[PDB]
Amino acid sequence: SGFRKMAFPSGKVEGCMVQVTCGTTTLNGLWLDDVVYCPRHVICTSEDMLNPNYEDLLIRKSNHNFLVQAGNVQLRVIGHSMQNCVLKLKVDTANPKTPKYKFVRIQPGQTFCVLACYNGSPSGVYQCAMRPNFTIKGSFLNGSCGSVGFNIDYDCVSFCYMHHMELPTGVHAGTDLEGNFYGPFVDRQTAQAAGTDTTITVNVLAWLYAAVINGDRWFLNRFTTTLNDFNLVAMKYNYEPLTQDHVDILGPLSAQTGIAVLDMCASLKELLQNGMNGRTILGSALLEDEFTPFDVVRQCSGVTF
Amino acid sequence: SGFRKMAFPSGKVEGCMVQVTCGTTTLNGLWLDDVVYCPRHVICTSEDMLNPNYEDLLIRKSNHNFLVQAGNVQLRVIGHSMQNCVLKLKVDTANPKTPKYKFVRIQPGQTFCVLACYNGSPSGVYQCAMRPNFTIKGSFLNGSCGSVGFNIDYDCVSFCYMHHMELPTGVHAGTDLEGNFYGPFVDRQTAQAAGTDTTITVNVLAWLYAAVINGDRWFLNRFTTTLNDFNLVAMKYNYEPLTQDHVDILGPLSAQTGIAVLDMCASLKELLQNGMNGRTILGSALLEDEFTPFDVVRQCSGV
Ligand SMILES: *[C@@](O)(CO)[C@H](C[C@@H]1CCNC1=O)NC(=O)[C@@H](CC(C)C)NC(=O)c1cc2c(OC)cccc2[nH]1
Ligand SMILES: *[C@@](O)(CO)[C@H](C[C@@H]1CCNC1=O)NC(=O)[C@H](CC(C)C)NC(=O)c1cc2c(OC)cccc2[nH]1
């Protein structure tokens, strides 16, 4: 038993982190087979970052301008290209530690593990959630750009995030492994503000199911509700609306506990309208929204990879 | 900026996780060099676990009784010894993925990272703290015995915990890599209780410093307190006393924020007596104590 913020093992992603340096600008890159993926602003200097033209700056660069380093071993760049805000560099060596992988664009609320890297050297690992406003409440310092977020399924590593920005409010923003930003942010040295955040309803419900599984079920009521009526009420409390995919992934926890998705919704809808009246769930009076139904299943069922 | 429960990368440890099987009992083992470490209750049957005479049960075992599997390969046990509750299995092959490692006994309040494994396969990683009562609030299911906790310094892995037991309260207990249990627990199949837990004060103060570094300052105040007067209130609320060493370890965080330790203590004392109202610190409604000054300094340096 026990419920904690659990991250996937990072062994597979560690062997793919490399250091990409252009001039004096250095960040982390992802070495998959014979291609290294990294943020494109590495070709930028301190001043160009203010207002850059990446297409203009890239034409002035050649393969020999890029320094790719695995440890202290250089990987000669034999080709370069730009896809959105991500830069792709072909190297002369196929990563012998390349795992079965895939590129995926996660959804708001979905969780992933972040491998904090600095100078191509992994330093820490932690789990985080893609907030409804397309930001992540992570932990990043200078030199963390290029750090990737991932999910481990079976033996495939599904890369879904590459770090780029830290907003003024302390949150962070990035793109997928195809250079496409999450949210309306841009890779420029500018103070950008994200939209108002909301509570991830699907995750709060998965937390409730985690409680019901652990004998804590006082919050269950004899009420039910429609998916539409619940979503309209949930928005009045800063709770993200539920989707078809949300109801589906809540199935396993629904069958295991025997409580229908729409029954738990009415139970959560009551917790929002009347409060908690003291008391707590899983020992905490604060509703947690950064545990997906999978995180509840994986951690309560010991799923390995 | 930002603060998050961060664990060390588990790559160097994943290459050492194997599966040990004896009869109908299976658990995880740690393969370092030509040796494999695992809990000794793997040699026990469902009946022996109730009251195991491990010395007796061990001598009645042979090398071929232990099935050590490393992925799709089986390791040949050419020897077996016992060091307290840890069973040392010698094999014919040396683990090439064996990193530079050391065996250390963690202290209460210190933190380490746990690599949860089931059947010799890593399932997840998280950071946890050795509670003052020598338990840990981890996440372990059946087949988790053999999982190890560790800290990494440069490229040297410091092993300090091997999982064994889940108390009836839902907490977890285990031993260091020398087989010595943390706390007054024994590896028998009995319901065991731990001593009354206390809060790691120095970790709470460090976590408050992390909150201030990240823009949270509502709990601060103008008052200041003496070390003794703070400890009097801390002990009253079941908080570990703050030592002059603890004050020194907090120095770097006090300089970065400009808030003196005894000034932070005044805030904590007020939080203990008045509560947190409906407010939160770093997204939490409870005073966190599973972050050491080092863990805070690592994430908040330069911010
Ligand atoms: C990468 O290391 C760049 O390689 C960092 C990541 C941040 C450093 C501290 N913590 C981080 O998460 N990214 C940057 O330094 C750039 C990214 C651009 C060039 C794509 N800048 C910012 O993140 C940035 C810029 C501003 C700003 O404009 C001056 C105002 C407020 C915040 C801010 N953040
Ligand atoms: C190992 O996986 C066994 O190989 C297992 C892991 C824990 C149980 C589920 N979660 C865990 O973290 N450990 C045990 O089952 C140990 C075995 C001992 C060391 C031989 N025992 C317990 O966890 C245990 C026994 C009892 C008990 O008695 C009977 C009464 C109440 C709780 C309890 N836990």
SS (H, E, C) B197-208: CCECHHHHHHHH
Contact status, residue A103 vs residue A75, Cβ threshold 8 Å: no
Domain range annotation of chain B: 14-91, 201-300
d(CA A136, CA A150) in angstroms, rounded, equals 13
Sign of dihedral through CA atoms B231, B235, B239, B240? positive
**Interface membership of B277 toward A (CB under 8 Å):** no
Contact status, residue B75 vs residue B68, Cβ threshold 8 Å: yes
Q: Select from B208, B261, B198, B251 the least CA-distant residue to B230.
A: B261
- Distance (angstroms) between ligand 1 centre and the Cα of A151 equals 25
DSSP state of B70: E
Alpha-carbon dihedral B179, A300, A171, A176, rounded to 10 degrees: 110
Phi/psi at A272 (nearest 5 deg)? -85, -35
- Tell me the longest C-alpha to C-alpha distance in chain A: 69
Of the candidates A124, A137, A166, the beta carbon closest to that of B8 is on A124
Q: What is the CATH superfamily name and number for domain A100-175?
A: Trypsin-like serine proteases (2.40.10.10)
End-to-end CA separation in angstroms for chain A: 20
A111 sits in which H/E element = strand A111-118
**Interface membership of B25 toward A (CB under 8 Å):** no
Q: Among 1.10.3720.10, 2.40.10.10, 3.40.50.720, 2.40.50.140, name the CATH number for the domain at B14-91.
A: 2.40.10.10
Which residues have a Cβ under 8 Å from the Cβ of B279 and sit 6 or more positions away?
B218
Which residues have a Cβ under 8 Å from the Cβ of B240 and sit 6 or more positions away?
B109, B132, B198, B199, B200, B201, B202, B234
Q: Select from A191, A168, A164 the least CA-distant residue to A85.
A: A164
Phi/psi-derived region of residue B289, left when phi > 0, alpha when psi is between -120 and 50, beta in every other case: alpha
Q: Select from B36, B20, B30 the least CA-distant residue to B80.
A: B36
Strands, DSSP E only, in A53-96? 66-70, 73-74, 77-83, 86-91
Residue A145 a catalytic site member? yes
* A241: helix, strand or coil: coil
The CA distances from residue B59 to A36, B81, B188, in Å, are 55, 10, 19
**Helix B201-213, helix B261-274: angle, nearest 10:** 100
Q: How many CB pairs under 8 A join A and B?
A: 132
Domain boundaries B201-300, corresponding CATH code? 1.10.1840.10
**Interface membership of A140 toward B (CB under 8 Å):** yes
Domain boundaries A12-91, corresponding CATH code? 2.40.10.10
Count CA within 13 A, CB hemisphere, residue B276. Answer: 16
Count CB-CB contacts under 10 A for residue A290.
19
d(CA B73, CA B76) in angstroms, rounded, equals 10
Alpha-carbon dihedral A249, A250, A251, A256, rounded to 10 degrees: 130
CATH 1.10.1840.10 fits domain A201-301: yes
Contact A302 B14 (CB under 8 A): no
d(CA A258, CA A217) in angstroms, rounded, equals 12
User: Which ligand places an atom closest to the C-alpha of B116?
Assistant: 2
Mutate which of B145, B172, B182, B192 for ligand 2 pocket (most atoms within 8 A of beta carbon): B145
Count CA within 13 A, CB hemisphere, residue A198. Answer: 19
Query: Does residue B12's CB lie within 6 angstroms of at least one atom of ligand 2?
Result: no
Residue B38 a catalytic site member? no
Mutate which of B17, B40, B42, B164 for ligand 2 pocket (most atoms within 8 A of beta carbon): B164
d(CA A52, CA A27) in angstroms, rounded, equals 18
Q: What are the strands of the beta sheet with A35-39, ordered from one edge?
A: A73-74, A66-70, A17-22, A25-32, A35-39, A86-91, A77-83
- Distance (angstroms) between ligand 2 centre and the Cα of A240 equals 40
Contact status, residue B123 vs residue A305, Cβ threshold 8 Å: yes
Token pair recorded at residue A214:
């652990």
Which residue out of A117, A145, A160, A265 is catalytically annotated?
A145
Contact B125 A172 (CB under 8 A): no
Q: Which amino acid appears at position A247 of this protein?
A: V
Cβ neighbours of B122 in A, within 8 Å: 9, 11, 304-305
Contact status, residue A187 vs residue A227, Cβ threshold 8 Å: no
